[PDB]
Design an enzyme around this catalytic site. Structure first.
Site, short mmCIF file in Angstrom:
data_model
loop_
_atom_site.label_atom_id
_atom_site.label_comp_id
_atom_site.label_asym_id
_atom_site.label_seq_id
_atom_site.Cartn_x
_atom_site.Cartn_y
_atom_site.Cartn_z
N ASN A 120 0.68 -1.27 0.21
CA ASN A 120 -0.10 0.02 0.02
C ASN A 120 0.88 1.27 0.01
O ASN A 120 0.29 2.36 0.32
CB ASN A 120 -1.21 0.11 1.06
N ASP A 133 -5.13 3.20 -0.03
CA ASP A 133 -5.98 2.48 0.79
C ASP A 133 -6.14 2.74 2.22
O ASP A 133 -5.99 1.66 3.07
CB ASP A 133 -5.58 0.91 0.54
#
Ligand SMILES: CC(C)[C@H](CO)Nc1nc(Nc2cccc(Cl)c2)c2ncn(C(C)C)c2n1
Length: 256
Positions: A120, A133
């Site tokens: 991420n 995210d």
């Protein structure tokens, strides 16, 4: 106003753990031709920060929620990590410092980056990182879970700094600090928080990891009272100018 017809699909970047993410090219003025990453869904998303992915457009279309965000050319840190299997402390100090800033900001907005992991953390063309995210305030990859989360005794900002510690360890050694043969064992290893320190790590790095890997979230670095500063003032980041880092003035060690 925004509309799915305003973006032509270029290719599917990958299946999602958040829906499907497509590489799209805006067709309407004024940003006609601009590339974006499109996410389709069937909780904050608008954050402005040099190290957090920007949301450009958001429109609902019969059950589908479209999110038009920055397209980060460099890909993610997980991909780079797999190929290089481990980064130098120099590279690590840099990514973690920018992540430190991004993370703290999300914390100020009252957001808990529950899914913090290399997958991420994206890189732009310059090589700077960008967190994606995030968003959830009111709460996954087990190897990255803090012990209070494994035991479900809570999940505050402290949990993120533990995960931050895990990311550091994985980037520095190529391995996860707590790994079992399965989820169960991994969770138990996290709980014992029994950790062997690889000898090739600098004493500054080792010090920082020990401070981040405190089972009790109240003794974990980052637990105030100066919060993130507590971590930014750590000897490990002595040579980091936070002012220019924020301004993206520090040259990324890696250039995609
Ligand atoms: C679909 C996954 C395989 C990847 C990597 O985690 N996700 C991904 N890749 C991105 N970039 C990217 C760049 C070059 C090659 C590849 Cl495979 C992905 C990306 N840019 C912006 N975002 C989100 C804010 C939606 C992105 N998300």
């Amino acid at each position: 106003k925004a509309d799915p017809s305003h973006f032509e699909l270029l290719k599917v970047l990958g299946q999602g753990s958040f829906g499907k993410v497509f590489l799209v090219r805006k067709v309407t003025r004024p940003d006609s031709g601009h590339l974006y990453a499109m996410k389709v869904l069937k909780i904050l998303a608008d954050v402005n920060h040099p190290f957090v992915v920007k949301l450009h457009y958001a429109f609902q279309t019969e059950g589908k929620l479209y999110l038009i965000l920055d397209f980060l050319r460099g890909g993610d840190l997980f991909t780079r990590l797999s190929k290089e299997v481990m980064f130098t402390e120099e590279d690590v100090k840099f990514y973690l410092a920018e992540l430190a800033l991004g993370l703290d900001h999300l914390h100020s907005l009252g957001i808990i980056y529950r899914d913090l992991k290399p997958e991420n953390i994206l890189l732009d063309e310059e090589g700077h990182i960008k967190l994606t995210d995030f968003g959830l305030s009111k709460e996954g990859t087990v190897e990255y879970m803090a012990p209070e989360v494994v035991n479900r005794q809570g999940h505050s900002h402290s949990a993120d700094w533990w995960s931050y510690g895990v990311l550091m360890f994985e980037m520095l050694t190529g391995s996860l600090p707590f790994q079992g043969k399965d989820r169960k064992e991994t969770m138990t290893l996290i709980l014992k928080a029994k950790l062997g320190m690889p000898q090739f790590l600098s004493t500054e790095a080792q010090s920082l990891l020990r401070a981040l890997f405190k089972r009790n979230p109240a003794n974990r670095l980052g637990s105030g009272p100066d919060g993130a500063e507590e971590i930014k003032r750590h000897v490990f980041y002595s040579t980091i100018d936070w002012n220019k880092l924020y301004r993206r003035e520090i040259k990324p060690p890696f250039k995609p």
